[PDB]
Ligand SMILES: N[C@@H](Cc1ccc(O)cc1)C(=O)O
Ligand SMILES: N[C@@H](Cc1ccc(O)cc1)C(=O)O
Ligand SMILES: [K+]
Ligand SMILES: [K+]
Ligand SMILES: [K+]
């Protein structure tokens with residue numbers, strides 16, 4: 001209530017790939033899994049963040065101890081997306097917006113830990129492990145590890161090479177069993193599995209989501225009803241096409257796991273509303289062309305405005321506007 | 330007593346190159362120069378260390394505030410010449426041996442500051458400047474800067490790229506006006522002159538010695554009379570050749586600045602002893618072949634045993650043997 005097998009299924013459902021199944025099952029047989037997710041405090045979170053937030057939700061339902069890392073320094077090291085004062089402001093926008101998302105999807109916040117990188121990444125023992133790690137890692141391996149993650153520019157900065165080793169050490173200093181992120185990470189993840197043990201630390205389990213296409217190709221978490229509508233009307237959803245369909249993906253990765261069902265809103269003329277209890281059923285009806293793109297979008301629009309409603313409320317304070325504007329000028 | 334002009338001459342004599350003459354003279358017009366020298370606590374110091382020690386001696390005679398940096402972390406980052414426990418032991422061998430050298434040449438120790446890198450290089454603000462610097466420096470520039478200094482290996486380690494930026498930041502954290510080292514450094518020095526100002530810190534004066542050939546091509550600071558003799562008898566000193574002559578170089582860079590003269594020990598049959606008050610005079614007599622290699626070596630041998638005598642005494646304790654043996658097993 002839940003058994004280790006129900007835990008495993010909740011944690012790993014919808015992932016593209018699990019590294020470390022063997023240790024993962026060892027742990028779940030005995031105790032709760034410790035896991036984190038990291039986000040560099042970079043650009044404004046948009047509705048696509050509900051994809052990783054839905055997995056965090058599943059981790060909590062499974063009994064996991066979840067940490068969220070606001071990787072402020074990593075934002076700095078990644079070709080200075082975020083500068084030195086103006087990192088701290090984005091940290092608070094990210095903390096606020098992320099907690100409102102999770103509240104909105106009904107995730108208990110109370111056993112979720114939020115930490116920011118500069119709470120621990122400038123400490124002496126951490127900094128010492130960074131040098132230690134620098135003495136066994138090649139520029140080659142460090143460069144290879146960040147290829148998909150750090151912005152690739154004409155003359156690579158030294159910070160870009162540091163970035164992967166810090167993300168690996170994060171696993172140890174957050175004292176987790178596992179890290180969850182997108183499949184893009186994978187080379188950083190495999191990097192951490194190889195080098196952490198050279199520092200005498202255990203390799204971690206790694207859980208990778210697919211790169212899920214976006215709803216519009218961005219819809220902002222604070223956008224008005226009216227802009228959600230207009231952004232959706234532009235959204236690309238081809239009749240009968242179940243590949244490369246950001247609308248269907250949003251349903252699969254966010255709306256189904258939320259209530260374990262999805263309601264298509266459809267006029268009586270075409271069958272009336274239908275409630276699907278599994279994604280594969282909706283997909284089949286869409287391929288068969290008995291769910292129209294316009295009905296699919298409207299069913300997502302309704303459900304998405306339900307998600308965004310609280311968030312827009314909370315952030316309808318003048319301090320939060322100050323924060324938003326200050327954070328992104 | 331000394332004027333700024335006598336100061337400048339003492340500080341810059343025998344150098345191959347001065348960067349920053351303009352600021353250097355500005356400072357000496359008003360106050361004492363702050364300067365350091367750094368040595369990675371790597372292999373056992375040998376008699377060739379008297380070359381940089383003679384310049385440190387001149388810096389003190391000039392009124393300079395001199396810092397000596399025992400760069401323990403740099404020893405680690407430089408392809409792990411020195412490991413983690415066994416760094417600290419070498420630091421104390423280096424501190425002991427260096428102070429005995431300076432005592433031996435009559436340098437007052439009392440206004441010389443000794444510091445080791447790990448006293449300050451793991452601190453938070455230092456570590457933050459390391460990331461800061463990493464965000465403006467390219468792998469390319471950092472790699473280019475260490476080419477002559479860090480051991481170049483088949484697959485370069487990330488630590489090798491860090492090494493130059495740390496040596497630059499050292500200038501700021503030691504609060505010096507200037508750094509003295511060998512000409513090999515030069516690319517690290519020019520690196521520091523370019524990037525320190527991008528962190529909002531001033532560029533420093535840089536003072537570079539030539540790469541002086543060695544006495545035997547090593548003579549250890551603790552070698553017995555008898556091994557100094559045998560090592561010298563092998564030493565290469567071609568008749569009439571004043572280039573590439575480690576014996577003459579040792580005289581020019583160590584023995585002349587020590588007493589401002591040098592005594593050639595020579596039998597009456599060939600003129601008897603002669604006292605030279607300038608290097609250029611000795612050089613001329615050697616080119617002319619009226620100072621023989623065997624007399625040149627014996628004159629150096631005598632003077633060198635005078636240098637090493639105290640040092641061998643001091644280190645004739647069982648703790649110091651313990652230290653030596655422990656440091657180099
Ligand atoms: N690399 C992650 C962010 C992150 C940073 C540090 C970590 O420890 C973990 C994750 C991303 O691209 O989104
Ligand atoms: N690079 C110097 C050692 C050193 C290290 C750090 C410094 O800040 C200065 C000097 C050498 O090759 O001998
Ligand atoms: K981000
Ligand atoms: K990013
Ligand atoms: K050295």
Ligand SMILES: [K+]
Pocket residue numbers: 369371372
């Ligand atoms: K060395």
